[PDB]
Each structure stands twice: as C-alpha cells, then as structure tokens.
Amino acid sequence: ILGGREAEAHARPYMASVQLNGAHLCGGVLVAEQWVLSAAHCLEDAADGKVQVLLGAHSLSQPEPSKRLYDVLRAVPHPDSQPDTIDHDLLLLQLSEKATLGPAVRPLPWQRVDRDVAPGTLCDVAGWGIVNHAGRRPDSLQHVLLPVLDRATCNRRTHHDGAITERLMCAESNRRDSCKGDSGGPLVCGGVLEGVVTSGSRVCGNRKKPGIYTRVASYAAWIDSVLA
Ligand SMILES: NC(=O)c1cc2c(NC(=O)[C@@]34C[C@@H]5C[C@@H](C[C@@](N)(C5)C3)C4)cccc2[nH]1
C-alpha cells in the first residue's frame, strides 16, 4: 500500500494473506467459512510450492491469539483467466477445513447485485504489499481509503486506454494506491466487498494509471458454482 497507514489490528477480520512457501504473496478475502477469494495471477508459476492462507493476522511474523495458518484443499483459478491479460483475474481457495470464526476472523458480505459503485465512493483497500519505491515490505497490515474512479475517465488514452471492461472497476491512484503484494486483496465499499485488486504488475501511486479491481458482482454465478 503506498501513501497509507497501519491498519487497526483485527479491524478487518476478512483480511487474508495468501502465502507461498511461508512468504506473503498476495492479499485475499474470506468470503465463506471455507473459501478465500484472491487474484488468479497469484497462483501462476506457484505449481509445486506450498500455498497457505493466514487468517486473523495483523503482524505477519509475531504470535497473535487469532492468527491461524490454513492449508489449501483446492486452488480454483477462473477458467477464462490468462497469463497475459487482466481479465477474469479471480482465484478461489478452499481451506483444508472451515475457518474458526470469531471477532478477528469473519467472512465479508460480498456484492451480488451487478450495478456499478458510484464514482467518488470512498472504498477501503488493505494489504501487506510494498510501501515505497525501494520495495520495503511492512510486517503489519496497511490500508488506504480510495475514491472510485468512473470507467470512462479510466478508459481515456492518457489512462488505461479502453482496457477497462464492464467487469472491471477503477479507483484513484494519486499518491495513495495499492502496490506489489496487494494483488488479490479486497476493495470494500460501505462494508461490502466490491472488488479484488488485479494481480497484473502496474505502476503504483501514479494518477495517470488508476488502480484496477475486478468487480465481484460480475462473477457472482462463477463464485457460487465453485463453492457448490
Ligand atoms: N495491483 C497492484 O497494484 C500492483 C501489482 C504489482 C506488481 N506485481 C504483483 O504484485 C504480483 C501479483 C501476483 C503475485 C506476485 C507475482 C505476480 N506475477 C502475480 C505479480 C506479485 C508489481 C509491481 C507493482 C504492482 N502493483
């Protein structure tokens, strides 16, 4: 997270750290008792490596009573996702068992109505991604409040030049932004999950290249199919 601040410990009980061989790789969001939603590019080239999900965490390294590392039974990338595209960039992770719920571990209600979030809506994005241009990794969860950017501005030649489909959404990136390692994390608007940070490498903190987030409402039927 660039231009953000340390999040209040355990105030986002849905927050997941998707890890490969014990290292934070991507953000994630607990969407059901046994299911964590993330971005599909996260799992690319992971084939062999041990994928796990850390729930109830604030610090990645320190012991916390609510902190629990879960093994993964199944990794389900969207069938239409592709290495060289930003489309259908969603990944569903089935934990080895249903998560132990409590004040620091709870699924987040997610948007099923396929209508756009209003431009200007202040949304929350959290993560353990880099915090500066040098690549400094924070030990504890960071967050930033970002206003949603209308699709037409986001689609200008100066910005993302027509790459923003109706299944994608944008947020402003003026100094405050998601960055490397925030990929797959949640964009929460009015206490409801609206987007998943895309996992395509993108410049961070540049106003002319807004944040791109996959709209969960656009994939409601796919998320339901997988969980079933
Ligand atoms: N979303 C953003 O804001 C944003 C992402 C990003 C980035 N790249 C990643 O974060 C990942 C995401 C997953 C897991 C890891 C390998 C990878 N190929 C797939 C790329 C790291 C690099 C530089 C700036 C960036 N900015």
Side-chain angles (χ1 to χ4, degrees):
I1 297 292
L2 295 198
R5 290 177 197 196
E6 193 174 340
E8 175 191 350
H10 314 294
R12 297 162 178 77
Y14 51 84
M15 194 66 208
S17 164
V18 176
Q19 310 198 330
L20 184 67
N21 298 316
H24 172 81
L25 177 61
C26 278
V29 48
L30 186 69
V31 291
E33 284 186 48
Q34 207 175 341
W35 292 91
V36 168
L37 179 65
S38 191
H41 300 307
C42 296
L43 198 86
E44 279 172 13
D45 297 87
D48 176 88
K50 185 157 191 200
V51 189
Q52 284 165 307
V53 179
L54 180 64
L55 300 181
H58 183 62
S59 167
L60 293 168
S61 65
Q62 293 190 153
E64 298 170 352
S66 58
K67 231 169 105 170
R68 188 172 169 188
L69 194 66
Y70 285 87
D71 285 317
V72 175
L73 184 56
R74 278 201 282 159
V76 187
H78 192 285
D80 298 304
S81 61
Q82 279 191 97
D84 291 319
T85 79
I86 67 164
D87 308 303
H88 324 303
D89 192 23
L90 292 183
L91 167 72
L92 274 166
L93 304 168
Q94 193 191 13
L95 313 173
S96 52
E97 64 177 322
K98 292 170 185 83
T100 301
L101 306 186
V105 182
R106 184 75 51 184
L108 179 64
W110 61 271
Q111 190 61 258
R112 286 175 179 81
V113 175
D114 193 11
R115 279 199 291 272
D116 280 333
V117 179
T121 301
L122 283 167
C123 305
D124 186 82
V125 65
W128 287 270
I130 70 171
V131 294
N132 63 22
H133 290 173
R136 179 186 204 265
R137 295 274 185 168
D139 174 71
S140 71
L141 188 68
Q142 306 295 301
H143 83 104
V144 74
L145 265 178
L146 303 178
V148 164
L149 178 75
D150 77 277
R151 188 175 293 101
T153 303
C154 204
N155 269 334
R156 299 171 170 203
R157 193 193 194 179
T158 55
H159 295 70
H160 286 306
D161 187 27
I164 318 301
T165 66
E166 68 164 60
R167 316 193 76 177
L168 289 162
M169 71 184 283
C170 297
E172 296 186 34
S173 49
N174 193 210
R175 312 175 306 271
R176 296 170 192 190
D177 205 358
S178 62
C179 203
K180 200 240 167 183
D182 296 314
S183 298
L187 181 69
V188 182
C189 316
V192 174
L193 176 71
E194 289 286 352
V196 174
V197 183
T198 61
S199 58
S201 299
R202 173 190 57 89
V203 67
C204 331
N206 180 356
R207 64 161 55 225
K208 295 296 157 185
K209 298 280 166 287
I212 305 171
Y213 306 83
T214 302
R215 298 174 60 247
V216 298
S218 192
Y219 295 85
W222 175 74
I223 296 158
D224 295 327
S225 172
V226 174
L227 270 56

